[PDB]
Paper text:
Production of metallo-β-lactamases (MBLs), which hydrolyze carbapenems, is a cause of carbapenem resistance in Enterobacteriaceae. The genes encoding MBLs, including IMP, NDM, and VIM types, have become widely prevalent via bacterium-specific transferable genetic apparatuses such as plasmids. We report here that sulfamoyl heteroarylcarboxylic acids (SHCs) can competitively inhibit the globally spreading and clinically relevant MBLs (i.e., IMP-, NDM-, and VIM-type MBLs) at nanomolar to micromolar orders of magnitude. X-ray crystallographic analyses revealed the inhibition mode of SHCs against MBLs; the sulfamoyl group of SHCs coordinated to two zinc ions, and the carboxylate group coordinated to one zinc ion and bound to positively charged amino acids Lys224/Arg228 conserved in MBLs.
The modes of interaction between SFC and NDM-1/VIM-2 were also determined. The omit maps corresponding to SFC molecules were clearly visible in both complexes, although the second SFC molecule, which is slightly farther away from the first SFC molecule binding to Zn, was observed in VIM-2 structures. The key aspects for binding through the sulfamoyl and carboxylate groups in NDM-1–SFC and VIM-2–SFC structures were quite similar to those determined for the IMP-1–SFC structure. The sulfamoyl group coordinates to Zn1 and Zn2, the carboxylate oxygen O1 coordinates to Zn2, and the other carboxylate oxygen O2 binds to Asn233 and Lys224 (NDM-1)/Arg228 (VIM-2). Of note, there was no corresponding stabilization caused by Trp64 in the L3 loop of IMP-1, which holds SFC in the active site, in both NDM-1–SFC and VIM-2–SFC structures. Such structural differences in the L3 loop may cause differences in SFC affinity; the Ki values determined for inhibition of NDM-1 and VIM-2 by SFC were 9.82 μM and 2.81 μM, respectively, which are >10-fold higher than that of IMP-1 (0.22 μM). Although the inhibitory activities of SFC differed with individual MBLs, SFC bound to MBLs via their common architectures, through Zn1, Zn2, and Asn233, and through positively charged basic residue Lys224 or Arg228 of the L10 loop.
Residue numbers in the entry: 32 to 262
């Protein structure tokens, strides 16, 4: 039912309805001769849409806006990037040119600049300290602490009990750490426990890459991170 790499031609985007007024968006890129999927979120905001994360690059993000207009036909007015990597901010220039207001924490904006990545326009206050939360239209933004990156946010949709973990949360089929160059391995399990503490009622948990599941993905990620730590 949820699309895999093999369902998504090069430069195409799929939308998946998770709950009333909540979709994931799924796109792909080749890296080092393998193909990787990437998830973001779309949340209905009255008669507008809130986007969580780009579709990983300018071409995919243009395709995302086209697929949203085709399938949903409500304007994307705001986008939040959940950390500074290219699967999150790659395509911010496309969003900005299309009239979308782009947001990230000041932590994310700084790290994007250092990386020479695209930089969301707006700075989100109130997310600087582990455990901080702010409402942003129909979602809650939560900074659990450093994990996959020092700036990683998670997004909760209270109407739908949907938790978007982003790249701090691994899919169940992922058994090894992969890209941890920017990770805080020491803090990652503590940060995951803050997510469990804040969102124990979550019914749907969406990782940055791969298949959604339930809250089991949190302890799954802790297991993989601790195994990597002890490598
Ligand atoms: C599978 C994957 O692809 C990319 C481009 C990333 S990231 N967010 O580390 O850049 C990851 C990740 O592990 O989050
Ligand atoms: C372009 C890209 O694609 C993937 C899948 C990765 S990563 N973060 O997994 O090594 C990267 C990278 O920037 O390292
Ligand atoms: Mg809601
Ligand atoms: Mg994963
Ligand atoms: Zn990342
Ligand atoms: Zn603005
Ligand atoms: Zn990622």
């Amino acid at each position: 039912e949820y699309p895999t790499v093999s369902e998504i031609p090069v430069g195409e985007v799929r939308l998946y309805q998770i709950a009333d007024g909540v979709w994931s968006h799924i796109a792909t890129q080749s890296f080092d001769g393998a193909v990787y999927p990437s998830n973001g979120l779309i949340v209905r905001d009255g008669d507008e849409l809130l986007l969580i994360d780009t579709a990983w690059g300018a071409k995919n993000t243009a395709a995302l806006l086209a697929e949203i207009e085709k399938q949903i036909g409500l304007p994307v007015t705001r986008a939040v990037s959940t950390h500074f990597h290219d699967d999150r901010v790659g395509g911010v220039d496309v969003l900005r040119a299309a009239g979308v207001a782009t947001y990230a924490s000041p932590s994310t904006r700084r790290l994007a600049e250092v990386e020479g990545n695209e930089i969301p326009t707006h700075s989100l206050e109130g997310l600087s300290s582990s455990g901080d939360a702010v409402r942003f239209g129909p979602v809650e933004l939560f900074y659990p602490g450093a994990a996959h990156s020092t700036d990683n946010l998670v997004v909760y949709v209270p109407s739908a009990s949907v938790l978007y973990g982003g790249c701090a949360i691994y899919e169940l089929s992922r058994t090894s750490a992969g890209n941890v160059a920017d990770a805080d391995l020491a803090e990652w399990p503590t940060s995951i426990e803050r997510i469990q503490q804040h969102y124990p009622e979550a019914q749907f948990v969406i990782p940055g890459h791969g298949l959604p599941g339930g809250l089991d993905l949190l302890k799954h990620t802790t297991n993989v991170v601790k195994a990597h730590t002890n490598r």
